[PDB]
Amino acid sequence: AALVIDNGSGMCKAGFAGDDAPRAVFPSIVGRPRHQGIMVGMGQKDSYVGDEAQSKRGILTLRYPIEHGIVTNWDDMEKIWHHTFYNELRVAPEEHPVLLTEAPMNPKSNREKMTQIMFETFNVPAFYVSIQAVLSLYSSGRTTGIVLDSGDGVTHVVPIYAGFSLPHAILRIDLAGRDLTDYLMKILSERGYSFSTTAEREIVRDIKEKLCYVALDFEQEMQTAAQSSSIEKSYELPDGQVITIGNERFRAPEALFHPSVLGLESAGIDQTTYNSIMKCDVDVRKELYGNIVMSGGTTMFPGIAERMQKEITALAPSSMKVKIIAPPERKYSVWIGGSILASLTTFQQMWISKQEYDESGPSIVHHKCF
Amino acid sequence: AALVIDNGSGMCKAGFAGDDAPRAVFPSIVGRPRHQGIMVGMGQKDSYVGDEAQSKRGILTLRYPIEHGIVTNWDDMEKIWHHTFYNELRVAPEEHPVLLTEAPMNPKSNREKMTQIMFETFNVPAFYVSIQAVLSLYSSGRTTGIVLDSGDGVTHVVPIYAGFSLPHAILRIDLAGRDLTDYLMKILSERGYSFSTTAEREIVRDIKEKLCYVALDFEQEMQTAAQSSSIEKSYELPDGQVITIGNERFRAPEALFHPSVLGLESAGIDQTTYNSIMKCDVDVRKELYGNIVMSGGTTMFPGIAERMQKEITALAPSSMKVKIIAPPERKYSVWIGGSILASLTTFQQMWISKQEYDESGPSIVHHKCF
């Protein structure tokens, strides 16, 4: 009975192998009080994790331990994993194998510290780290495809042909949904709405998840928003204030396709996918063009698949059939692939056991998870 | 067996922790004779405290030692506390912990002198100072709410969310029931009734407590009072003279909502409550709008809760549910919260002992009562 934990930058997904949906999906935030507790007998913890930190947002500073796929606070990461094991899944980690997720081209100390914390703090019997895009390909039943994975920390593009990784063609951008949340925070001040705190950042993230979309033609959509008022929508703040947003619904996701509005020199996701395809051998590009898979929460914008199809079809040769696979459950696709991968009988010999960690230290994670 | 003393500007409330009502409620006045005693063998003290000063009003000058929450006469304060301990409660203060009350944003010398007098003159074994609004929240069983406390000296608005104080949003006005008594004294001269002495000030305070109320619509109430005579009431003076009052029943409490009739530049209590709510984080305002708590004697005007609800609902967004909590026993609510707070076992480690005062002086009251 293995445990599958998709530990992304923004949201933690956790559950059991063999299941089809994550049992526990909760934000990976740690909240700490900014003020002094004055009423006694209440019961006031010094730390709040997950949905409890989200429900007490107005008196807490919220911190993400993971930034751009890299854990920057390991004590808060340990707190989040403890909340995963003991409060959400309600299991003992000493009797369950654990499969973790990681973004490609991460520092090696991240993998080593994850292995050390899993084997020493939680005393797991078995452990493995997988790349998220490979799990996204696992969930779709495919062995050939190019995966665009965009969550909250980073966006990575990984091509796989016939079950073989092509690590020279793996591309990675530091743009994901948190940068889109910050950009929407910046461009909402043009209408007079000020958001600066971490709780207001969570409010703007809710605004982006509810009302933002990807325009098929950006300049035509700007002309339509300038002409009429059919684009503007209303959102109710937690204090009852109603705000109205116009072109910011599609200007903020446009940073995914044109990162220069963030001051970034990198290319957009369509150009990155095309460059990853062109970095591969000429005999695999046809299968990659027809098997473009998207996973993650940032691929859940309305109209992102049609725009991605249009831009890649513009980039590709005219005889190539470009197909974008954006299933309705793609936001959990990485986890679903983990739930497939930990459930295979061929995978059962690829676990890192406690004996191998005892004889080799954390560095065995560089020899068993490749 | 702790002692709870709500030492407000106008009235002193005193009793034991674990009780539900104050054992001794009496005016905090010191009376001194204006004339010379001519009959010998009577027994004539040079000072009268409390109800004895109130029963001998016609030959005494009455002085309040506390003005706007700040003690201005410490010898008379010592006399009132001596009358509390030895004549009203009839206890020895050397064997009972004492919990005192204070308004927020008071001078630090007030707290220091209260600690010094409690530990040196009365030799208490333990001591604590609390903010009155926090005790008002204690009495209602709430840990989240915004407290409007108005007694005789000052009106303070304190928001608390999830047991956490928000001291940047605490607001304080120097308008309370004594200023309303003085305003009623001023506007009763329009009908030909002259009140200038301190005993006449106590008579006008009795008139305000018996016959004044808060109008729902002030201009409509003025039109109704100008049209008919159904608003006018009669009051009997101590010498048997019967006076009749009309619009002064609702013109005097209207200074609570429009302080400009007192020559004050501050806002009314509804605007102050709204400004304190808007000074807080956006994620706590919903719980503050539905948990507006009033305590004190100035909140015992008839119709003040309906008017407060109407004005705050006018100020708040239309989707916000404004609830005013005005319980029938709110005039003693601060004391009741003290009787709860001194009765908690978790509070028993937060007393300032005699050893800490001996090793640190009065300044320990700035480190233990926050």
Next chain:
Amino acid sequence: AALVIDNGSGMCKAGFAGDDAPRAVFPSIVGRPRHQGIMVGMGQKDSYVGDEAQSKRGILTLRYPIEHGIVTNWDDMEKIWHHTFYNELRVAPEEHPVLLTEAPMNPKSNREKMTQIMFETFNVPAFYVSIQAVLSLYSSGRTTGIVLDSGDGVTHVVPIYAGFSLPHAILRIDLAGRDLTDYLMKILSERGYSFSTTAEREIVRDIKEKLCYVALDFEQEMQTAAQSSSIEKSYELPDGQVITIGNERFRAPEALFHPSVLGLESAGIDQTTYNSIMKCDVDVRKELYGNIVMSGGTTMFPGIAERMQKEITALAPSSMKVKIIAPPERKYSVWIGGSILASLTTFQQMWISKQEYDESGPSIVHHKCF
């Protein structure tokens, strides 16, 4: 050609706007015979007003219609105003606008009855009521100052800054020259001089106007009067009896600064002026300290300005320049300000006309004279 009538408690001042002195100054007394007329053919009226009542004092009971600024006998007030219009000024009131005076914080029925009597009994074309202290500020050419006005009925302290009234800081004491006359009547019985009748009250008023003064240091003056006989003066009664007075020359005006010798709980005039200054905003106090204006007959005591300056300089901060303005013509200053105010062209639109009274009744005096 407007008429200016300063109708004080003790003395009536009357004349024309544009003049510098009142045309007719006479006591506001009504005298009635105590005995039966026995000689026929003389011509014996049932009522004597003014100087005729003063010249026939020994067979009349003298009554003041105004007590402490409030008219208590309106028929005698009508008699005095008739004597003003037809015997003193010798005009027709139906063709002259009339400007009247009133003390602040008077009953509203006094103003209403004054308006009704002026418009109905005397049929004036225009009418206005002013506060006396504002006219005292008008006479000195000042727009900023604090006026201490003390005549025969009441003493009022009114601060004005930059032409703006500060009605929350207006203070009023029921001590003036009539109470000083009664106190001098009481303390002259210690030397064996009995005065009980109204004519003897007028004699004692003459004694106070001729021989009383304000001591700079009261205890030093009492020591000087106890040591030598240089303070004692002689006064000749109307029957030729010569009386001698000592410390009563300065003990009777000392009730202005210490009202407790009258059995009054109020403060003295220096403390009342200081309390009125401290009731104002902190940015106007500097101009009020240097512009203290005195008007009225009770401010005509010798040495009252030096004593007022000394006590206010003791009360004020040491960096404040206290200036007392006591001009030699201040006893008529209110009237002089009326003669200025009714002579201004900007004031000519502020009269209450007969049409406004016909359409609104007496209550228009609460809407036009504020």
Next chain:
Amino acid sequence: AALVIDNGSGMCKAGFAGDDAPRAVFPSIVGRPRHQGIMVGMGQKDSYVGDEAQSKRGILTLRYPIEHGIVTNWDDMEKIWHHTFYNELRVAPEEHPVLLTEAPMNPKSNREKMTQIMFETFNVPAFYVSIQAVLSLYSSGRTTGIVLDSGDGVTHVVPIYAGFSLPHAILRIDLAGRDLTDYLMKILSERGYSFSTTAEREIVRDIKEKLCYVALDFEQEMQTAAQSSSIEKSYELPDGQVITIGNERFRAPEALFHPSVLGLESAGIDQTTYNSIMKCDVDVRKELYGNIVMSGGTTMFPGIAERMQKEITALAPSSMKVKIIAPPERKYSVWIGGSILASLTTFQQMWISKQEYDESGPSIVHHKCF
């Protein structure tokens, strides 16, 4: 002959291009009377602007039309600009180009309404809006530097490298000198000094400008203030009262470096400057570390440059030379840069003319001022 107007939240600076100092520096306040004018013939306007509102503080409510860099009252803004053009500069705005200032990340309606009021109410021939920090860089002769601008409304940090703006790295805090004035008002009540009105707010602003400073080590300065009395200073109030202040001289500016004492979740000015430097490209950080420019009145605290240098040198790598440029005339630096920018011949083609406004409306300000 262009006009340069630095229209900040607290103070309005105005003059001519080519000059080195602003011709007219005056507070941007509008004062309205709280009371009724009682003396006629004075001349009493319903509105007072600037120094006339400051000289009549005790009878006025003072309002700032700009809060945190955003105009909240446009009629009072029009009054202040009318006072600038016709009473201070004494010019006709119809023949002079006008260059205005704005804080970055302001609402677009502020710029649009400024353009509409300048072109329609005042009928200017030409118009431009600049960012204040770019003008601060203009005044120092620099084309590369990071500007910390803190006045009365907001604090903004803007980096510029080789004449190129970096708008993704522009940071903005809502903390400036008005919040410091309010914090000093709050912490002066601990010593028993009460300030609540707008005139008292101006008095506390004068106290902060005269006696407050930035401590190099805050805890060492608190220990020094607790040990001896060499830190305490005396201030004379307008009514002559002398108050004494101790650690509040350096506790109030400490909110610039630790905003959590205001209940704010933002970082201090040193951390904000460091975060703006780290938001830029790695090849420009060396020039930004050595060219940190401060401008505005809130940077005129004694010891703020040494403390800023110490904290940034603590934050920066040890091989980096941190240089803080705090010239003695930096309080006018924005205006001086405007006087440079409007005097350049290359700038003369960048004005928004009346023809462009007539053909395009206010929205042309989003196409010409970037």
Next chain:
Amino acid sequence: AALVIDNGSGMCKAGFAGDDAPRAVFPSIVGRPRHQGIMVGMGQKDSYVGDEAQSKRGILTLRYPIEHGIVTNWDDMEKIWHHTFYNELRVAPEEHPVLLTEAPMNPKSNREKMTQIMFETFNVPAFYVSIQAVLSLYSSGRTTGIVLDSGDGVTHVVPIYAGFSLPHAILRIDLAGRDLTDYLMKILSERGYSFSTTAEREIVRDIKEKLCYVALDFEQEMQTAAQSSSIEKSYELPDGQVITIGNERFRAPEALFHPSVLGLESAGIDQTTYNSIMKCDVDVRKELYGNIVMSGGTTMFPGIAERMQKEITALAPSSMKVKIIAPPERKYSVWIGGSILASLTTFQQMWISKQEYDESGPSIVHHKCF
């Protein structure tokens, strides 16, 4: 007075025939601004070439016009040649013959467009294109040898025996120093150092030039780097950050000998040199084994000659004397050979004149430069 221009992918070398060193060596980059110029009067070109683009790296996107020896942007190539002629050499190209360089097995349109731009844009009187490896053999005084030339775009291996080219044995790999820079960028993310921009690519190129070397035994060097810390070195970034690198010093140049770590199917430089020798006739191999010449910047790694000697001696028969010629000035060797070749009197009849270009078009470059 001919001009010799070695126009490689990364660096442009330029000077005069008869000299021993290039007069001007500068990077062949064109920089364009990513942001908008905000400060006027500076002087801001839209394009920066060479060292000016390198000194303004943080606000520019840098582009190489030559990729793998082939010009991909001819306008930027024209800009670089204009900067060579007019800013670096400071000559007129209309009076100087120009000798250019090219890699073998290039497209014919590259040579044709180079001839057309030289004769039409710059109006040169004479022109020639040479292969770089033949010039490397010219610089060493040799007429027999096999040249391994590796710069920034491509690596080519050209054997020449007795002055005769052997074009069937010329080999070409698309691996050179730019691919090594990209590989070092990829493997520096394992230590947590992120480099993605073009300026960061130039920084990583500086890191590779300063700290990278070729290991004699790769597995022994990996064991030594894993055992101790004597291999790790420190580098200071332009912002003052100090980074530490370990095995990446020799892992990145190992792609020259094992291209499979780049995802390339080609052989290493030692195997390519051996395969080029074995493609020749059996009677010339002895002279080629003893005359292996290296030129270019990628041959300037420390230890590349010893490793090349070891691997070729392993590949060659044991009786063959393998000699690697790696002179200290080999990075400029191509240019030096050009400076020899354009200085020979026998070469003076082999120029392509303007008359031949006018009568034949660009295609004459396929008949005169073989």
